[PDB]
């Protein structure tokens, strides 16, 4: 509509595309997942692009998708 072309509202900055902002940034985020076989922590990407396997209890943790990789149904995550 008519926007301050400097520093705009955060409600519009989190709305527009990650390239088109005034300073570009990521939108993926890292997160700690508990593999439910043996309960120990590993980090994982969000758009994880490959099947991570927690080498301690090497089950599976997330299968990838076109965007955010979905996690495997018994996992528990902390966003960080």
């Amino acid at each position: 509509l008519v926007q301050d072309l400097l520093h705009p509202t955060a409600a519009s900055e989190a709305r527009k595309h990650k390239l088109k902002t005034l300073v570009q940034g990521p939108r993926s985020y890292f997160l700690d997942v508990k593999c439910p076989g043996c309960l120990n922590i590993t980090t994982v990407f969000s758009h994880a692009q490959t099947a991570v396997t927690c080498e301690s209890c090497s089950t599976i943790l997330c299968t990838p998708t076109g965007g955010k990789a979905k996690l495997s149904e018994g996992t528990s995550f902390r966003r960080k």
Binding site: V23, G25, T43, A48, V52, K80
Partner: protein, 134 residues
């Protein structure tokens, strides 16, 4: 043609949730490369699993630099390698069924795209000149 790119952040003292050291990263990188993983794949594997943001900002130097620094470097650049083996696969397919003029058109485009960065790489001399299509 549109845009589809990652946008690496403004931060460069990354990332302050990184408990891990800066030597085990190089250890994991040389492990994956002597497992036989291309720079793109070793970068994405330790991005996801042993979560780095990027090794150029956790370690002080890019992964091609540390692969040369640990004596594990490629003999042709990664892009020329992947594009060469794509060219040999489409040539093998057209050799199998030689009626595919669409594959002929695509092979002409693939070889032109080979010649572009080939003469670029000759002008910068990473792989030496006299080099024309293996």
């Amino acid at each position: 043609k549109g845009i589809s790119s990652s946008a690496i952040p403004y931060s460069r003292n990354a990332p302050a949730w990184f408990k891990l050291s800066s030597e085990s990263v190089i250890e994991q990188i040389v492990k994956y490369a002597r497992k036989g993983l291309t720079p793109s794949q070793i970068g994405v594997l330790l991005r996801d699993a042993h979560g780095v943001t990027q090794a150029r900002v956790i370690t002080g130097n890019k992964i091609m630099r540390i692969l040369k620094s640990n004596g594990l470097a490629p003999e042709i650049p990664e892009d020329l390698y992947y594009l060469i083996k794509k060219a040999v696969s489409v040539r093998k397919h057209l050799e199998r069924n030689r009626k595919d003029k669409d594959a002929k058109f695509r092979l002409i485009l693939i070889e032109s795209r080979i010649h572009r960065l080939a003469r670029y790489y000759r002008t910068v001399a990473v792989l030496p000149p006299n080099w024309k299509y293996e």
